[model samples]
Target: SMNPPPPETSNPNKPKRQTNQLQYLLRVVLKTLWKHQFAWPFQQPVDAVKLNLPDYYKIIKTPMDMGTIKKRLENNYYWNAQECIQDFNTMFTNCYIYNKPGDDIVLMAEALEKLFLQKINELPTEE
Candidate 1:
């Protein structure tokens, strides 16, 4: 099977690009998921959080499934709080961002988590 070269990138990093097919596949399936418009499994605001419908963003799409994305996010043991926030932001750009501030839990949770975590860290520890 022929793997079509990814956009704009030269042959210098083809192997690296091919190796990154996981992120590509994740993006593709999630685009379809965004278009699904009815998979309301989460308690979060699904409609508000869903990215562009009918695949507005681009992905390399080397064939993967939903479980991969789920497993990848969950199984990435190296992911710290900062990594989580960065990935979360990258994966979904709020359609309303041009009009208003996004209302996702990460926005609020990151703030409160910072404050509370700092407060807890500052607490005097007893022997």
Candidate 2:
């Protein structure tokens, strides 16, 4: 009987460990945003026709929101945590682009962005 020994040269757990840590941090930020008062407008996708803002879609090429973000996280749709952050950024950026700086939604975006940055900064940097 001949049996080959299992290969022990490469470590496979490090990538998974880092991915879990990143996703955990992402979820923490997402939950915080979901609970935030300003998160209301950003919770769901904007309906251009329903809102009667046809230009909304024209201006916002790519829309993002808490619901979508959460789905992506749950589905493991993100390649990395940075992609999650980028979607959040896109969500806020779209708000800014479509709404006036002084508009309530834009204000909320600003506040949420601040909160997001704070939470992200607090998370441990990836090794």
Instruction: For each candidate, give its TM-score against the true structure.
Output: 0.25, 0.80
Best by TM-score: 2
lDDT by residue for model 1 (1-127), tens: 3333322212333233212333432344333343342322221322221543323222313322223334444344212333323333433333223223545533543443344344333333322
| Alpha-carbon runs more than 4 Å astray in model 1 | 1-55, 58-70, 92-94, 97-127
The clash count of every prediction, one per candidate, is: 0, 0
Q: What is the lDDT of residue 76 in candidate 2?
A: 59
lDDT at position 41, candidate 2 = 78
Best by lDDT: 2
**RMSD for each model, in Å, please?**
12.9, 13.2
